Amino acid sequence: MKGQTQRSVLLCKVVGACGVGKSAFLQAFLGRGLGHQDTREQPPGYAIDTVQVNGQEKYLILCEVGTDGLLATSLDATCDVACLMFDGSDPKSFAHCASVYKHHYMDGQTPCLFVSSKADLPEGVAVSGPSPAEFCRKHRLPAPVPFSCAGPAEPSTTIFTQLATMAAFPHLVHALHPS
Ligand SMILES: Nc1nc2c(ncn2[C@@H]2O[C@H](COP(=O)(O)OP(=O)(O)O)[C@@H](O)[C@H]2O)c(=O)[nH]1
Ligand SMILES: [Mg+2]
């Protein structure tokens, strides 16, 4: 039917440098913010839970993948959607994240979502250009999504529905004129 897919299980790789918040992001997928985390439920570097996509229950696997040092080149990029994470409070974070995209995903068919982590902290701009938003406009990616794991409030679930939807229907992801 329209809006349905044979896929029951979707794979997202959460790809980013050490310290950008990948492990906390996986915990937030399971409904746990900073401190409220709980390690002994799922394997390290993995988080699985159900996500609704157009009324249908899907399983989304988040798979944590580092990019520090040699990992920036020694990357198995295969996944249904790549979540490219950079530290929104770190001036130097985005450039490394953008380089990973260019070398592994830029001219592929895998949907990519840039995520600006630690949105609760004071923002950290880079000295050179371009901005993360300008980079995504040029390479025709979605606008980078800010995310935060802190606060006493429950973590938002919107970005995980977005990742699951991109994974389920990879041909309807885009940047678009007119809107
Ligand atoms: N303020 C804040 N700190 C965060 C957030 N996410 C992660 N951190 C902290 O940043 C550090 C690295 O996070 P971690 O999840 O281990 O990153 P990883 O190395 O990419 O897996 C830890 O001290 C976290 O508590 C966030 O949204 N806000
Ligand atoms: Mg980690």
Residue numbers in the entry: 408 to 582, 584 to 587
What does the report in the manuscript say about this coordinate set?
To better understand the difference in ubiquitination efficiency between hMiro1 and hMiro2, we first determined the crystal structures of the isolated cGTPase domains of both proteins to high resolution (hMiro1-C: 2.25 Å; hMiro2-C: 1.69 Å). The overall folds of the hMiro1 and hMiro2 cGTPase domains are quite similar (rmsd 0.78 Å over 129 Cα atoms). The residues of the cGTPase domain that interact with hEF2 are structurally conserved in the hMiro1 and hMiro2 homologs, and a structure-based alignment of the four residues of the hMiro1 hEF2 at the core of the hEF2/cGTPase interface shows they are 100% conserved in hMiro2 hEF2. Interestingly, although the same conserved residues mediate dimerization in hMiro1-C and hMiro2-C, their dimer relationships differ significantly. We performed size exclusion chromatography with in-line multi-angle light scattering (SEC-MALS) and confirmed that both hMiro1-C and hMiro2-C dimerize in solution.
Both associate with Parkin upon mitochondrial depolarization and are ubiquitinated on multiple lysines18374546. Here, we demonstrate that the cGTPase domain is necessary and sufficient for efficient ubiquitination of either hMiro1 or hMiro2 by p-S65 Parkin. We also find that despite considerable similarities between these two substrates, Parkin modifies hMiro1 much more robustly than hMiro2.
